[PDB]
Amino acid sequence: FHVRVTLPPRKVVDRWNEKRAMFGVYDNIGILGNFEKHPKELIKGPIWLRGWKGNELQRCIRKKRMVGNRMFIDDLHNLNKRISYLYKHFNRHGKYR
Amino acid sequence: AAKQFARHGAASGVAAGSLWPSQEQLRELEAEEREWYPSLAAMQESLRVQQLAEE
Amino acid sequence: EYPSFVESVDEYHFVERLLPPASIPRPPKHEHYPTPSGWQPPRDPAPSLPYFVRRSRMHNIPVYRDITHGNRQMTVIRKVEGDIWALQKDVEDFLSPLLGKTPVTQVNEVTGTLRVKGYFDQQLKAWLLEKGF
Amino acid sequence: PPVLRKCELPVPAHRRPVQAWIESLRGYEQERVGLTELHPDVFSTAPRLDILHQVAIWQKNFKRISYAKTKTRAEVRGGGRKPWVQKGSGRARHGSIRSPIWRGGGVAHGPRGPTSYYYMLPMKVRVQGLKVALTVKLAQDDLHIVDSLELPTADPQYLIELARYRRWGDSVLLVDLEHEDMPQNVVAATSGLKTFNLVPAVGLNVHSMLKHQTLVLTLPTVAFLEEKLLWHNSRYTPLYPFRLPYCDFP
Amino acid sequence: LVCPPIQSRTYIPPEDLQSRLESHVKEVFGSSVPSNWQDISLEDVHLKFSFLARLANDLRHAVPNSRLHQMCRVRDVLDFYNVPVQDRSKFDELIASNLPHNLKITWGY
Amino acid sequence: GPRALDLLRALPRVSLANLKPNPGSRKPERRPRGRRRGRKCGRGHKGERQRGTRPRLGFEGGQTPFYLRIPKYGFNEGHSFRHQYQPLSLNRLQYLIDLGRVDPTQPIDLTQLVNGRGVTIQPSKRDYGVQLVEEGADTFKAKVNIEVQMASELAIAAIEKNGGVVTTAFYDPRSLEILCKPVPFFLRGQPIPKRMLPPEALVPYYTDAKNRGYLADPARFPEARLELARKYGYVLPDITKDELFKMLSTRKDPRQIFFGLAPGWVVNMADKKILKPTDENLLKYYSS
Ligand SMILES: [Mg+2]
Ligand SMILES: [Mg+2]
Ligand SMILES: [Mg+2]
Ligand SMILES: [Mg+2]
Ligand SMILES: [Mg+2]
Ligand SMILES: [Mg+2]
Ligand SMILES: [Mg+2]
Ligand SMILES: [Mg+2]
Ligand SMILES: [Mg+2]
Ligand SMILES: [Mg+2]
Ligand SMILES: [Mg+2]
């Protein structure tokens, strides 16, 4: 439980730096902009996760069905295995049945 | 391609005549349509045998 | 071998019909009120009661019925701009002869909404046609 | 010449409009250059911090993808075997040394993979949120309408000191109609500033509205906004996407 | 290019108010005063602007933007300007409030 | 307006710094830590449940499962192929003309009912159109041209009495789709196909002047229609003499999906231009 003896340099953060000032800027783009582009397109991320949501099982099964054949051998394997495990666990376990 | 014509299609530089079935496509659509969908008169006559048999 | 086609613009006013409205028609002014389906417009002036009821985006009176747990019956008055407390006074005082006792009330001041135990939907509809909201 | 702006849209019968000073940006000392009627249904709406909150969060989250993966006892390097036998050793029994119990072994639950929180606050809600935000920036007196936005010069000190003369508070969000039409002195002076910001009204947003101690709206901008928002109390439920052809609609 | 030194906004109404304002009624509306000078409506945009502008410079004081939906009669503007406002803080006021000797406030900012 | 407004002059800025969501919005999650919710964490003691494996849902502990003792039956039998018709009450109709959503002036078929959002059709779900009921029978004052897929006697009556003309027209799954959300079909940019003929079993329903079936012989239209009045006891109006006559007369081909268009055509909505085939085989195809 021995704890840090010397004060760290206080991290100074300008909340006024570019990215933070400009946060959430185009959020209303569809509405204010006579909808053409959806808020979705403001999402920069992993191919299969854009404008979508799900629990682990759905995520995984999705990554598979989308990028599956572009994955490395080993990751792929671990993915199929995680899938199986999850199948078994969500369907076949719980308190609530 | 079809969809792209629908969007703009003037500017899309899509060949218009291509938006209709080919001679093959045409004769096949023809073949199936006359196959599974009989004539109105012909359907009435299909019904007369039934109604009279049940009578 | 692409079949030949013909480009003419005069049949386009047929296609014009098929486009749906993205905004609701203001309802046709008639000679006779109420209408066959029972629709009454709000007045030319508005009353001086220190509260008001916006009609629905359908120009219907914003009184609805709602249940909870299948057995709890409720009636919701919506879109009310003014002192709702007054509206509460007047509503419960309208209903009290009907039930012999004041009906239970929940006022939501921030929501601009009123809530009342039981189904008064029909009678509140009328009573807001009275005051012409 | 007094600039006096009438609302381009019908007010409901029981409700009078609002009025804001039109300030201009060329002189420090030209404070009220004119008068504008604002629509009650946008800038007078019943203030609801509830929805402010809701949508403010929805702004924060819905973009969020957290990439944090931890490795389950399946994904760790090795230890595909029972370290020693079930019985007789006289110590606690284990499967793989990658049992989460073990030191260098797996993580039981933890984070999983790229993980997204994405959800769509319903339409008319986000809409009514901008509504409220504006109403609030106005009612707390910190909204300033401008005409023009033509700036005397590209010196940013001028701008800072202008905010100083008008007691504008620390931060400011400047809103203009389009990206192309912003005059060159605005762009110049502001792009070299931290606190002030310059944005097309297509990117007006709640979070930013609250993030800046003062909102400043151009007249064409307001005439635009008022309309775009007011559209929604009067609108049908979409049949198909609105981006498509509609009778009345663009 | 210069920057004007700020006003303190601290306000007390002068005793000549009524006369200033009525002078501004007659000059802004250009009207010979209908018998009630303070009950005439401000609804017209031009007249309202001219009125509150001249009133802005003369009294060295302006109306907050919210309050501008709230001015209709001239009586409203009257009662508005009748009210003083202190820009001093609760603290600055605490200093000037005649403090008992056993209380010493230091300001560490 | 909302005096709440004037309370905000008093208060400090609304900013991110101060925000509370509506009380009772977030009902807080709890976590199995601590003395109360730790230690068996509401999972019980031992047995099956504590280990998370309790058997599947239909299960009775091996006694022959409730849902499985009961014999099968034709119930949901052929449920997929049983036609559905979305109901439309007359009361709703009167409503929709009253608020001027659908206007009686120009002809009324399904499409218009749709665009007023007065009805909703999900063709993929085996919905074969709108059908008519008599609910506002006495309420109904409007003079209207209506084309539906099904209607009931009393309904036909209540439109007749006011002097409108009702026609029973059929649509197949595909054509019905094209009907309901037409603009997105155009943006599909495919030609506008032939209409199907109703199936064999349905044939008798559409060949009767009894229903004023669109495929029925017009020679019985004036007959059976007048008959409707003697049964329900009112004076039958003369439609031929009316001003709005030429709209009420307006029909479709049994091969036509819309009003004013024809099978084989193609709509370019960018150029606002219609395209028709000049090729013969095509015209023989789509005009047959
Ligand atoms: Mg999960
Ligand atoms: Mg409910
Ligand atoms: Mg292993
Ligand atoms: Mg092994
Ligand atoms: Mg093992
Ligand atoms: Mg290690
Ligand atoms: Mg590790
Ligand atoms: Mg316990
Ligand atoms: Mg135990
Ligand atoms: Mg046990
Ligand atoms: Mg349905």
Tab-separated table of N, CA and C in Angstrom, chain D residues 70-199:
chain	number	residue	atom	x	y	z
D	70	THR	N	-8.905	-6.312	-23.654
D	70	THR	CA	-8.086	-7.079	-22.734
D	70	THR	C	-8.177	-8.548	-23.175
D	71	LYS	N	-7.224	-9.379	-22.782
D	71	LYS	CA	-7.215	-10.736	-23.301
D	71	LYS	C	-7.819	-11.735	-22.332
D	72	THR	N	-8.782	-12.512	-22.809
D	72	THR	CA	-9.364	-13.595	-22.020
D	72	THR	C	-8.406	-14.760	-21.924
D	73	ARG	N	-8.675	-15.658	-20.983
D	73	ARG	CA	-7.832	-16.827	-20.744
D	73	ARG	C	-7.675	-17.691	-21.987
D	74	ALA	N	-8.477	-17.402	-22.995
D	74	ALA	CA	-8.341	-18.036	-24.283
D	74	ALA	C	-7.252	-17.389	-25.154
D	75	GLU	N	-7.070	-16.089	-24.998
D	75	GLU	CA	-6.233	-15.344	-25.928
D	75	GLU	C	-4.801	-15.091	-25.461
D	76	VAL	N	-4.499	-15.495	-24.237
D	76	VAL	CA	-3.159	-15.341	-23.703
D	76	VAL	C	-2.211	-16.289	-24.446
D	77	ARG	N	-0.905	-16.065	-24.326
D	77	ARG	CA	0.106	-16.775	-25.122
D	77	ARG	C	0.042	-18.303	-25.213
D	78	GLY	N	-0.063	-18.955	-24.069
D	78	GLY	CA	0.274	-20.362	-23.965
D	78	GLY	C	-0.349	-20.896	-22.693
D	79	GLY	N	0.157	-22.013	-22.179
D	79	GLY	CA	-0.437	-22.641	-21.007
D	79	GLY	C	-1.636	-23.450	-21.420
D	80	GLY	N	-1.437	-24.238	-22.461
D	80	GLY	CA	-2.489	-25.083	-22.960
D	80	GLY	C	-2.586	-26.342	-22.119
D	81	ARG	N	-2.045	-26.332	-20.906
D	81	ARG	CA	-2.053	-27.566	-20.134
D	81	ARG	C	-2.160	-27.431	-18.621
D	82	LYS	N	-2.693	-28.482	-18.011
D	82	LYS	CA	-2.704	-28.603	-16.576
D	82	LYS	C	-1.283	-28.587	-16.086
D	83	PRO	N	-0.953	-27.616	-15.243
D	83	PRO	CA	0.407	-27.405	-14.788
D	83	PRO	C	0.915	-28.616	-14.010
D	84	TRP	N	0.095	-29.161	-13.108
D	84	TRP	CA	0.384	-30.446	-12.435
D	84	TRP	C	-0.898	-31.196	-12.097
D	85	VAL	N	-0.776	-32.401	-11.541
D	85	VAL	CA	-1.948	-33.247	-11.422
D	85	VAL	C	-2.949	-32.778	-10.431
D	86	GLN	N	-4.135	-33.302	-10.664
D	86	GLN	CA	-5.285	-33.079	-9.837
D	86	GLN	C	-4.972	-33.341	-8.367
D	87	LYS	N	-4.458	-34.533	-8.107
D	87	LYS	CA	-4.390	-35.027	-6.747
D	87	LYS	C	-2.992	-35.376	-6.258
D	88	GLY	N	-2.801	-35.205	-4.952
D	88	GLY	CA	-1.665	-35.745	-4.226
D	88	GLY	C	-0.548	-34.753	-3.972
D	89	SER	N	-0.449	-33.718	-4.809
D	89	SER	CA	0.587	-32.705	-4.622
D	89	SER	C	0.335	-32.057	-3.276
D	90	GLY	N	-0.943	-31.838	-2.993
D	90	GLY	CA	-1.320	-31.191	-1.764
D	90	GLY	C	-1.247	-29.682	-1.906
D	91	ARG	N	-1.435	-29.168	-3.121
D	91	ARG	CA	-1.665	-27.741	-3.254
D	91	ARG	C	-2.909	-27.531	-4.072
D	92	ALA	N	-3.309	-26.270	-4.194
D	92	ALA	CA	-4.551	-25.907	-4.867
D	92	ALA	C	-4.534	-26.322	-6.331
D	93	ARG	N	-5.638	-26.903	-6.782
D	93	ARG	CA	-5.747	-27.412	-8.143
D	93	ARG	C	-5.955	-26.313	-9.173
D	94	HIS	N	-5.338	-26.441	-10.335
D	94	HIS	CA	-5.533	-25.441	-11.364
D	94	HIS	C	-5.602	-26.063	-12.718
D	95	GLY	N	-6.196	-25.329	-13.639
D	95	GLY	CA	-6.138	-25.674	-15.041
D	95	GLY	C	-4.919	-24.938	-15.512
D	96	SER	N	-4.993	-24.401	-16.708
D	96	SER	CA	-3.908	-23.605	-17.246
D	96	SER	C	-3.375	-22.540	-16.314
D	97	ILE	N	-2.084	-22.292	-16.407
D	97	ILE	CA	-1.468	-21.190	-15.707
D	97	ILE	C	-1.984	-19.844	-16.177
D	98	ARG	N	-2.837	-19.841	-17.193
D	98	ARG	CA	-3.482	-18.619	-17.642
D	98	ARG	C	-4.865	-18.414	-17.063
D	99	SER	N	-5.234	-19.251	-16.112
D	99	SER	CA	-6.367	-18.928	-15.273
D	99	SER	C	-6.223	-17.503	-14.760
D	100	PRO	N	-7.293	-16.733	-14.853
D	100	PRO	CA	-7.330	-15.345	-14.414
D	100	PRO	C	-6.863	-15.165	-12.995
D	101	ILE	N	-6.955	-16.215	-12.196
D	101	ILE	CA	-6.413	-16.190	-10.852
D	101	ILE	C	-4.942	-15.939	-10.871
D	102	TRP	N	-4.299	-16.544	-11.846
D	102	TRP	CA	-2.858	-16.533	-11.920
D	102	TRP	C	-2.258	-15.208	-12.311
D	103	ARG	N	-0.982	-15.048	-11.992
D	103	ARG	CA	-0.289	-13.789	-12.173
D	103	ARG	C	-0.373	-13.286	-13.583
D	104	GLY	N	0.360	-13.925	-14.473
D	104	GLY	CA	0.447	-13.434	-15.829
D	104	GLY	C	-0.669	-13.913	-16.727
D	105	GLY	N	-1.689	-14.526	-16.144
D	105	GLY	CA	-2.786	-15.072	-16.927
D	105	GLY	C	-3.903	-14.118	-17.306
D	106	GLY	N	-5.010	-14.671	-17.796
D	106	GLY	CA	-6.062	-13.901	-18.437
D	106	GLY	C	-6.834	-12.928	-17.584
D	107	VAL	N	-7.589	-12.062	-18.244
D	107	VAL	CA	-8.437	-11.119	-17.535
D	107	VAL	C	-9.897	-11.511	-17.684
D	108	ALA	N	-10.523	-11.705	-16.527
D	108	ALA	CA	-11.834	-12.329	-16.396
D	108	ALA	C	-12.892	-11.656	-17.207
D	109	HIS	N	-13.084	-10.389	-16.905
D	109	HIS	CA	-14.077	-9.665	-17.632
D	109	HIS	C	-13.447	-8.480	-18.376
D	110	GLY	N	-13.184	-7.364	-17.700
D	110	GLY	CA	-12.506	-6.259	-18.359
D	110	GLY	C	-13.219	-5.704	-19.578
D	111	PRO	N	-12.499	-4.938	-20.380
D	111	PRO	CA	-12.965	-4.312	-21.613
D	111	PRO	C	-13.032	-5.306	-22.710
D	112	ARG	N	-13.842	-5.071	-23.722
D	112	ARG	CA	-13.761	-5.942	-24.873
D	112	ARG	C	-13.721	-5.150	-26.150
D	113	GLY	N	-12.595	-5.247	-26.854
D	113	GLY	CA	-12.512	-4.886	-28.260
D	113	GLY	C	-12.855	-3.449	-28.571
D	114	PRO	N	-12.910	-3.118	-29.849
D	114	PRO	CA	-13.561	-1.861	-30.163
D	114	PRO	C	-15.001	-1.957	-29.739
D	115	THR	N	-15.458	-0.957	-29.000
D	115	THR	CA	-16.805	-0.931	-28.440
D	115	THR	C	-17.464	0.430	-28.617
D	116	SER	N	-18.642	0.439	-29.223
D	116	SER	CA	-19.273	1.686	-29.603
D	116	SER	C	-20.483	1.971	-28.764
D	117	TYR	N	-20.653	3.228	-28.383
D	117	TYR	CA	-21.938	3.676	-27.878
D	117	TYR	C	-22.525	4.562	-28.928
D	118	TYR	N	-23.544	4.078	-29.585
D	118	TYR	CA	-24.136	4.880	-30.605
D	118	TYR	C	-25.611	4.753	-30.470
D	119	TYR	N	-26.282	5.876	-30.351
D	119	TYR	CA	-27.714	5.813	-30.296
D	119	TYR	C	-28.254	7.107	-30.820
D	120	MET	N	-29.424	7.038	-31.422
D	120	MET	CA	-30.007	8.223	-31.986
D	120	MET	C	-31.085	8.769	-31.075
D	121	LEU	N	-30.791	9.895	-30.442
D	121	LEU	CA	-31.832	10.674	-29.820
D	121	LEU	C	-32.838	10.956	-30.923
D	122	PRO	N	-34.134	10.804	-30.632
D	122	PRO	CA	-35.137	11.000	-31.686
D	122	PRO	C	-35.132	12.439	-32.220
D	123	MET	N	-35.547	12.620	-33.472
D	123	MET	CA	-35.453	13.889	-34.200
D	123	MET	C	-35.859	15.154	-33.462
D	124	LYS	N	-37.160	15.202	-33.204
D	124	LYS	CA	-37.826	16.369	-32.655
D	124	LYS	C	-37.242	16.762	-31.287
D	125	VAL	N	-36.551	15.813	-30.670
D	125	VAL	CA	-35.846	16.045	-29.420
D	125	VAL	C	-34.580	16.886	-29.551
D	126	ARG	N	-33.666	16.447	-30.412
D	126	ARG	CA	-32.458	17.212	-30.687
D	126	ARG	C	-32.872	18.603	-31.122
D	127	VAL	N	-33.846	18.630	-32.026
D	127	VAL	CA	-34.392	19.892	-32.487
D	127	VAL	C	-34.788	20.786	-31.320
D	128	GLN	N	-35.648	20.263	-30.450
D	128	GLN	CA	-36.144	21.101	-29.376
D	128	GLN	C	-35.016	21.474	-28.432
D	129	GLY	N	-33.921	20.725	-28.506
D	129	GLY	CA	-32.729	21.027	-27.731
D	129	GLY	C	-32.001	22.278	-28.181
D	130	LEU	N	-31.741	22.367	-29.480
D	130	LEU	CA	-31.206	23.607	-30.023
D	130	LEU	C	-32.126	24.739	-29.650
D	131	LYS	N	-33.426	24.491	-29.802
D	131	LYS	CA	-34.403	25.496	-29.423
D	131	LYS	C	-34.132	26.028	-28.027
D	132	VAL	N	-34.074	25.113	-27.068
D	132	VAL	CA	-33.917	25.509	-25.676
D	132	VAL	C	-32.603	26.238	-25.455
D	133	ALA	N	-31.516	25.671	-25.972
D	133	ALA	CA	-30.197	26.277	-25.839
D	133	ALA	C	-30.228	27.743	-26.241
D	134	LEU	N	-30.804	28.007	-27.410
D	134	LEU	CA	-30.927	29.372	-27.902
D	134	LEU	C	-31.753	30.232	-26.972
D	135	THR	N	-32.902	29.703	-26.578
D	135	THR	CA	-33.790	30.427	-25.689
D	135	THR	C	-33.075	30.852	-24.431
D	136	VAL	N	-32.187	29.988	-23.977
D	136	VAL	CA	-31.483	30.201	-22.737
D	136	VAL	C	-30.379	31.240	-22.905
D	137	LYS	N	-29.607	31.116	-23.985
D	137	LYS	CA	-28.549	32.085	-24.298
D	137	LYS	C	-29.147	33.475	-24.431
D	138	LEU	N	-30.393	33.521	-24.880
D	138	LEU	CA	-31.102	34.776	-24.998
D	138	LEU	C	-31.614	35.291	-23.653
D	139	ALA	N	-32.222	34.408	-22.877
D	139	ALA	CA	-32.923	34.805	-21.663
D	139	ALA	C	-31.965	35.157	-20.544
D	140	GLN	N	-30.766	34.609	-20.632
D	140	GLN	CA	-29.733	34.914	-19.669
D	140	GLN	C	-28.941	36.104	-20.173
D	141	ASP	N	-29.439	36.677	-21.273
D	141	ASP	CA	-29.044	38.005	-21.770
D	141	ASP	C	-27.733	37.975	-22.566
D	142	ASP	N	-27.157	36.789	-22.671
D	142	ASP	CA	-25.830	36.635	-23.231
D	142	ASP	C	-25.834	36.338	-24.732
D	143	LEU	N	-27.005	36.405	-25.355
D	143	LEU	CA	-27.063	36.321	-26.808
D	143	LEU	C	-26.987	37.717	-27.421
D	144	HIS	N	-26.125	37.863	-28.427
D	144	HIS	CA	-25.957	39.117	-29.150
D	144	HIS	C	-26.109	38.913	-30.643
D	145	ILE	N	-27.164	39.472	-31.219
D	145	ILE	CA	-27.325	39.393	-32.659
D	145	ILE	C	-26.459	40.439	-33.320
D	146	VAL	N	-25.889	40.071	-34.451
D	146	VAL	CA	-25.114	41.003	-35.233
D	146	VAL	C	-25.703	41.053	-36.631
D	147	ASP	N	-25.467	42.163	-37.311
D	147	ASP	CA	-25.618	42.206	-38.748
D	147	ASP	C	-24.195	42.120	-39.249
D	148	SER	N	-23.990	42.208	-40.559
D	148	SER	CA	-22.637	42.340	-41.078
D	148	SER	C	-21.776	41.159	-40.650
D	149	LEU	N	-20.864	41.455	-39.717
D	149	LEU	CA	-19.659	40.698	-39.385
D	149	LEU	C	-18.480	41.185	-40.213
D	150	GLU	N	-18.703	42.165	-41.085
D	150	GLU	CA	-17.583	42.852	-41.728
D	150	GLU	C	-16.670	43.403	-40.636
D	151	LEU	N	-15.402	43.007	-40.657
D	151	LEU	CA	-14.452	43.489	-39.660
D	151	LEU	C	-13.524	44.565	-40.208
D	152	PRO	N	-13.348	45.650	-39.440
D	152	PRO	CA	-12.453	46.769	-39.742
D	152	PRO	C	-11.026	46.361	-40.108
D	153	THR	N	-10.584	45.186	-39.668
D	153	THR	CA	-9.172	44.823	-39.746
D	153	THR	C	-8.946	43.365	-39.323
D	154	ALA	N	-7.751	42.841	-39.594
D	154	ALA	CA	-7.399	41.451	-39.262
D	154	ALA	C	-6.628	41.314	-37.942
D	155	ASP	N	-6.443	42.433	-37.245
D	155	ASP	CA	-5.791	42.452	-35.938
D	155	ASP	C	-6.718	41.848	-34.886
D	156	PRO	N	-6.324	40.694	-34.333
D	156	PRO	CA	-7.126	39.995	-33.322
D	156	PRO	C	-7.288	40.785	-32.006
D	157	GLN	N	-6.307	41.618	-31.664
D	157	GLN	CA	-6.409	42.461	-30.474
D	157	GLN	C	-7.648	43.340	-30.535
D	158	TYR	N	-7.951	43.846	-31.726
D	158	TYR	CA	-9.178	44.595	-31.955
D	158	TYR	C	-10.401	43.819	-31.454
D	159	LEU	N	-10.497	42.546	-31.837
D	159	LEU	CA	-11.629	41.682	-31.477
D	159	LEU	C	-11.716	41.442	-29.982
D	160	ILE	N	-10.586	41.041	-29.408
D	160	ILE	CA	-10.512	40.808	-27.973
D	160	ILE	C	-10.955	42.053	-27.203
D	161	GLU	N	-10.453	43.205	-27.627
D	161	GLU	CA	-10.747	44.453	-26.945
D	161	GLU	C	-12.180	44.887	-27.185
D	162	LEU	N	-12.751	44.438	-28.297
D	162	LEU	CA	-14.156	44.686	-28.586
D	162	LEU	C	-15.020	43.937	-27.588
D	163	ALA	N	-14.726	42.650	-27.425
D	163	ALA	CA	-15.389	41.862	-26.404
D	163	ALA	C	-15.165	42.510	-25.047
D	164	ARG	N	-14.027	43.180	-24.882
D	164	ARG	CA	-13.747	43.863	-23.625
D	164	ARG	C	-14.644	45.070	-23.415
D	165	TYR	N	-14.882	45.829	-24.477
D	165	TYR	CA	-15.657	47.055	-24.354
D	165	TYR	C	-17.140	46.755	-24.144
D	166	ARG	N	-17.596	45.612	-24.649
D	166	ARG	CA	-19.009	45.243	-24.572
D	166	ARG	C	-19.338	44.333	-23.376
D	167	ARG	N	-18.328	44.071	-22.545
D	167	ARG	CA	-18.418	43.136	-21.417
D	167	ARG	C	-19.063	41.835	-21.835
D	168	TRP	N	-18.367	41.146	-22.720
D	168	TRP	CA	-18.892	39.977	-23.377
D	168	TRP	C	-18.577	38.701	-22.622
D	169	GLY	N	-17.763	38.814	-21.581
D	169	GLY	CA	-17.307	37.632	-20.871
D	169	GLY	C	-16.147	36.971	-21.600
D	170	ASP	N	-15.703	35.823	-21.097
D	170	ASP	CA	-14.432	35.229	-21.521
D	170	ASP	C	-14.428	34.619	-22.916
D	171	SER	N	-15.444	33.832	-23.220
D	171	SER	CA	-15.430	33.052	-24.442
D	171	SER	C	-16.534	33.482	-25.382
D	172	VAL	N	-16.374	33.191	-26.671
D	172	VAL	CA	-17.400	33.540	-27.652
D	172	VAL	C	-17.492	32.585	-28.841
D	173	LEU	N	-18.726	32.291	-29.237
D	173	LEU	CA	-18.981	31.533	-30.450
D	173	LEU	C	-19.677	32.377	-31.519
D	174	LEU	N	-18.950	32.647	-32.599
D	174	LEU	CA	-19.442	33.434	-33.722
D	174	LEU	C	-20.021	32.534	-34.781
D	175	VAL	N	-21.254	32.830	-35.153
D	175	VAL	CA	-21.945	32.001	-36.115
D	175	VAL	C	-22.237	32.756	-37.406
D	176	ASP	N	-21.903	32.128	-38.530
D	176	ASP	CA	-22.126	32.728	-39.836
D	176	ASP	C	-22.895	31.762	-40.726
D	177	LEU	N	-23.431	32.255	-41.838
D	177	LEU	CA	-24.378	31.472	-42.624
D	177	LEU	C	-23.741	30.315	-43.374
D	178	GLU	N	-22.663	30.580	-44.095
D	178	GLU	CA	-22.021	29.514	-44.849
D	178	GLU	C	-20.509	29.588	-44.745
D	179	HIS	N	-19.838	28.530	-45.195
D	179	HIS	CA	-18.388	28.411	-45.064
D	179	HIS	C	-17.633	29.302	-46.041
D	180	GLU	N	-18.244	29.548	-47.188
D	180	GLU	CA	-17.607	30.301	-48.254
D	180	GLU	C	-17.681	31.823	-48.057
D	181	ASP	N	-18.742	32.272	-47.395
D	181	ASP	CA	-19.112	33.687	-47.369
D	181	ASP	C	-18.584	34.488	-46.188
D	182	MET	N	-17.769	33.863	-45.357
D	182	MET	CA	-17.209	34.563	-44.217
D	182	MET	C	-16.149	35.544	-44.726
D	183	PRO	N	-16.282	36.840	-44.379
D	183	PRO	CA	-15.308	37.848	-44.827
D	183	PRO	C	-13.908	37.554	-44.304
D	184	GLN	N	-12.898	38.046	-45.010
D	184	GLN	CA	-11.529	37.594	-44.804
D	184	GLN	C	-10.892	38.126	-43.527
D	185	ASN	N	-11.393	39.254	-43.038
D	185	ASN	CA	-10.894	39.802	-41.784
D	185	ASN	C	-11.357	39.005	-40.563
D	186	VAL	N	-12.581	38.481	-40.613
D	186	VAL	CA	-13.070	37.610	-39.549
D	186	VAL	C	-12.186	36.390	-39.449
D	187	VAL	N	-12.113	35.662	-40.558
D	187	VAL	CA	-11.309	34.460	-40.662
D	187	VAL	C	-9.902	34.717	-40.163
D	188	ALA	N	-9.279	35.748	-40.725
D	188	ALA	CA	-7.933	36.131	-40.333
D	188	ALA	C	-7.823	36.313	-38.821
D	189	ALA	N	-8.514	37.316	-38.283
D	189	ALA	CA	-8.351	37.697	-36.878
D	189	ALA	C	-8.677	36.576	-35.892
D	190	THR	N	-9.699	35.796	-36.212
D	190	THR	CA	-10.162	34.777	-35.285
D	190	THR	C	-9.347	33.480	-35.332
D	191	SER	N	-8.893	33.066	-36.517
D	191	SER	CA	-8.156	31.798	-36.628
D	191	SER	C	-6.894	31.792	-35.762
D	192	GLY	N	-6.493	32.978	-35.311
D	192	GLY	CA	-5.360	33.150	-34.420
D	192	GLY	C	-5.804	33.378	-32.993
D	193	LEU	N	-7.012	32.927	-32.678
D	193	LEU	CA	-7.550	33.099	-31.339
D	193	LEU	C	-8.063	31.787	-30.753
D	194	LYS	N	-7.811	31.591	-29.461
D	194	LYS	CA	-8.267	30.400	-28.757
D	194	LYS	C	-9.722	30.465	-28.319
D	195	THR	N	-10.087	31.566	-27.678
D	195	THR	CA	-11.379	31.644	-27.007
D	195	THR	C	-12.530	31.866	-27.981
D	196	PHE	N	-12.297	32.694	-28.993
D	196	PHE	CA	-13.320	32.978	-29.985
D	196	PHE	C	-13.353	31.878	-30.983
D	197	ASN	N	-14.524	31.623	-31.533
D	197	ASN	CA	-14.588	30.630	-32.572
D	197	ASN	C	-15.528	31.030	-33.680
D	198	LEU	N	-15.301	30.464	-34.856
D	198	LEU	CA	-15.990	30.894	-36.058
D	198	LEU	C	-16.543	29.717	-36.843
D	199	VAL	N	-17.862	29.648	-36.958
D	199	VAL	CA	-18.456	28.443	-37.506
D	199	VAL	C	-19.677	28.700	-38.405
